[PDB]
Amino acid sequence: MPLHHLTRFPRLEFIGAPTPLEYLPRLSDYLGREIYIKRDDVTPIAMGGNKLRKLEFLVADALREGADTLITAGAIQSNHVRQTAAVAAKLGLHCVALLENPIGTTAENYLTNGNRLLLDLFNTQIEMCDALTDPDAQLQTLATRIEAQGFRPYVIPVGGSSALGAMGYVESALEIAQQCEEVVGLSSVVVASGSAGTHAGLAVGLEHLMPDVELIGVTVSRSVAEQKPKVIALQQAIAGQLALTATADIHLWDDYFAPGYGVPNDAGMEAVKLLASLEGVLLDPVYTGKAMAGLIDGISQKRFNDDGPILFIHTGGAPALFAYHPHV
Amino acid sequence: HHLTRFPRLEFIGAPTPLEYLPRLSDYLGREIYIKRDDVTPIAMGGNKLRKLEFLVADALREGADTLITAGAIQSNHVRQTAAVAAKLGLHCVALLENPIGTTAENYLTNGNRLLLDLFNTQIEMCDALTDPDAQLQTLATRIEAQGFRPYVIPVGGSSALGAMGYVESALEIAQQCEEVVGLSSVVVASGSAGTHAGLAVGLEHLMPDVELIGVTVSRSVAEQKPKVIALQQAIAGQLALTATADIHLWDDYFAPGYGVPNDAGMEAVKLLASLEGVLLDPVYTGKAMAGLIDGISQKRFNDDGPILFIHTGGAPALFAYHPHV
Numbered sequence: 198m199p200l201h202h203l204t205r206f207p208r209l210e211f212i213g214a215p216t217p218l219e220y221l222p223r224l225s226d227y228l229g230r231e232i233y234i235k236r237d238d239v240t241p242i243a244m245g246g247n248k249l250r251k252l253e254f255l256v257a258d259a260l261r262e263g264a265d266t267l268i269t270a271g272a273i274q275s276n277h278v279r280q281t282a283a284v285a286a287k288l289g290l291h292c293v294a295l296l297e298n299p300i301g302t303t304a305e306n307y308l309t310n311g312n313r314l315l316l317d318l319f320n321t322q323i324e325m326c327d328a329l330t331d332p333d334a335q336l337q338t339l340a341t342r343i344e345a346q347g348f349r350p351y352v353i354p355v356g357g358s359s360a361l362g363a364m365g366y367v368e369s370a371l372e373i374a375q376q377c378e379e380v381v382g383l384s385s386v387v388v389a390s391g392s393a394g395t396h397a398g399l400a401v402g403l404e405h406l407m408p409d410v411e412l413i414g415v416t417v418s419r420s421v422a423e424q425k426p427k428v429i430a431l432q433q434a435i436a437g438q439l440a441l442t443a444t445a446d447i448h449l450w451d452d453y454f455a456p457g458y459g460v461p462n463d464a465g466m467e468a469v470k471l472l473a474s475l476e477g478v479l480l481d482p483v484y485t486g487k488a489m490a491g492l493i494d495g496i497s498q499k500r501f502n503d504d505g506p507i508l509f510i511h512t513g514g515a516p517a518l519f520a521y522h523p524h525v
Numbered sequence: 526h527h528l529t530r531f532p533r534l535e536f537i538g539a540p541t542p543l544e545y546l547p548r549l550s551d552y553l554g555r556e557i558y559i560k561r562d563d564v565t566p567i568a569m570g571g572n573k574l575r576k577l578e579f580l581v582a583d584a585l586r587e588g589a590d591t592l593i594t595a596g597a598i599q600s601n602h603v604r605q606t607a608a609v610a611a612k613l614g615l616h617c618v619a620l621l622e623n624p625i626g627t628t629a630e631n632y633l634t635n636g637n638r639l640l641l642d643l644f645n646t647q648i649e650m651c652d653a654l655t656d657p658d659a660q661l662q663t664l665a666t667r668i669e670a671q672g673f674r675p676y677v678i679p680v681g682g683s684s685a686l687g688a689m690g691y692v693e694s695a696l697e698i699a700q701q702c703e704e705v706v707g708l709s710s711v712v713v714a715s716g717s718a719g720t721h722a723g724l725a726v727g728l729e730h731l732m733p734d735v736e737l738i739g740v741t742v743s744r745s746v747a748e749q750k751p752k753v754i755a756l757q758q759a760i761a762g763q764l765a766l767t768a769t770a771d772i773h774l775w776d777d778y779f780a781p782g783y784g785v786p787n788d789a790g791m792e793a794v795k796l797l798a799s800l801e802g803v804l805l806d807p808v809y810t811g812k813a814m815a816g817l818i819d820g821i822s823q824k825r826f827n828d829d830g831p832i833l834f835i836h837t838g839g840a841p842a843l844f845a846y847h848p849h850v
């Protein structure tokens with residue numbers, strides 16, 4: 198009921214029913230600790246993900262402005278760009294994607310397979326660039342050129358992580374709260390923390406619906422020092438827009454992404470292997486694999502606030518498995 | 526009625542979506558709906574999860590500790606079985622063949638085949654699955670001699686028990702379709718036959734006016750019809766029903782063979798992707814959608830009314846089939 202101001206934002210229906218919240222009995226056995234999973238990897242458009250929730254709000258907003266083109270940015274293998282491109286195609290909007298190679302790879306599958314293949318299936322107009330040094334500004338320049346061609350573009354920022362976009366994860370917290378109700382009394386929630394909309398949206402929602410639960414973001418691209426201010430700003434802007442206050446502290450663990458965004462690491466791949474072999478759940482080498490590696494090491498190192506049930510938010514990413522194989 | 530008397534595991538939960546496809550409908554000049562069984566929640570999804578609910582229940586009731594099955598290197602059925610084995614703590618042994626003689630690295634190692642590896646699937650390569658039921662049985666015996674307790678899942682999980690999952694799917698469809706329809710037509714890919722046959726039984730009894738058309742993906746009408754019919758009669762027998770409906774099959778859409786992409790198939794993949802953000806695949810749903818399209822093209826359906834396409838999954842093979850062969 199404190200999140201009722203959410204009702205006032207127009208949104209499209211991309212998801213429908215709440216995504217499953219499942220107990221992981223085999224993984225729990227192995228880690229010695231009750232673990233659950235929020236399956237946002239099973240959202241029903243083009244192989245799923247956390248970005249569909251944000252797109253419900255952002256695309257609603259675009260249509261409301263009479264836009265006919267969605268414009269966004271990410272790595273060649275971004276899930277966000279793939280989701281945005283899938284939603285564009287489904288609604289008959291044009292889509293332009295500004296892409297970069299953040300790891301300097303020349304591997305054929307990174308360059309052409311996985312998410313990148315799907316963009317071509319979606320008739321995505323592709324704009325390569327050297328490095329997204331200033332993505333907000335670089336998106337704007339692109340939007341101007343696109344407009345000059347007569348299109349009516351709507352810029353979706355990196356990962357859809359504006360306060361409006363992040364409303365989808367406030368919404369997700371309501372699902373989670375309901376799903377947990379009488380069930381598992383949760384101590385902790387683990388989510389990947391990248392462009393920050395998921396983390397920030399969950400922070401606001403969980404502070405007001407489950408204020409005793411500890412929320413941990415495992416960084417996938419940045420140190421705590423670089424990432425915290427970004428999650429905080431979004432948290433405050435989301436709160437502002439919902440006429441709430443957000444006093445919770447943001448928690449981040451930055452030990453699990455080295456050597457960099459989009460580079461696999463051993464602990465990441467081990468987590469992917471663990472979850473596949475124990476639960477038939479597919480994680481990914483860029484986001485959820487590193488996040489699950491974080492969760493695991495936090496049990497190892499007694500990093501969590503107590504010994505109680507943990508909820509892992511599965512944010513998607515699996516198509517990247519095929520792009521990352523055999524190596525980058 | 527009797528469907529309930531069969532033990533089943535919960536792999537799916539809520540009914541899968543049934544969606545109108547307004548952009549595709551607009552382009553074809555015809556109302557089109559899709560049953561999204563590509564969205565089942567385990568390891569990238571598919572039609573086989575429905576069958577596995579019944580078959581794996583049965584395995585557990587016999588105290589098995591190992592699932593054994595067979596398919597192509599890029600089979601979805603094997604990948605779905607392997608995921609289910611992994612999640613239940615069961616070992617899995619997959620008997621694989623290369624049905625198209627390819628040496629392309631992604632066909633051999635990526636897509637579904639990569640996933641088997643992540644699931645710790647024990648892999649048995651063989652030159653050709655000439656007699657899959659027999660070959661599976663021999664395998665089962667050697668596995669048993671190592672002290673395991675194996676349970677054979679036949680190709681495609683298409684035994685009468687396995688096909689109960691698609692009788693079940695017809696219920697979901699029937700209930701979902703009251704808001705909408707009236708359907709004239711349902712289109713599904715017809716391979717090892719469990720999907721086709723189970724839908725045949727369910728739909729005869731729940732929507733007897735709807736025409737069900739299977740687009741073959743591996744065989745001529747002459748070869749496939751007896752297989753679907755046998756399964757239809759066995760399913761009906763086990764539910765103490767009769768099944769008098771004719772089986773309809775279109776075999777024009779799979780040349781030059783099982784597991785080989787064709788132009789119409791890839792054009793169907795491209796069409797659904799660019800119009801609806803839906804992902805089909807080169808082996809199964811792409812060819813099936815090509816058939817639905819050509820049926821409209823050639824006025825092959827019984828009338829001009831709404832069509833339901835059953836999406837049976839397959840998308841991970843897109844990544845195995847790229848760039849070619």
Ligand SMILES: Cc1ncc(COP(=O)(O)O)c(C/N=C2\CONC2=O)c1O
Nearest residue numbers: 271276356391392393394395484512514
């Ligand atoms: C599977 C997966 N998990 C997690 C995230 C991170 O959530 P976020 O913090 O982004 O809200 C992304 C999106 N990645 C977007 C953000 O980073 N670069 C991209 O194009 C993703 O695809």
Ligand SMILES: Cc1ncc(COP(=O)(O)O)c(C/N=C2\CONC2=O)c1O
Nearest residue numbers: 601681716717718719720809837838839
């Ligand atoms: C996406 C997809 N569609 C359709 C089918 C065919 O369904 P059926 O008619 O067999 O129930 C399969 C079956 N996988 C079987 C079919 O052929 N060999 C296999 O491994 C499949 O993976």
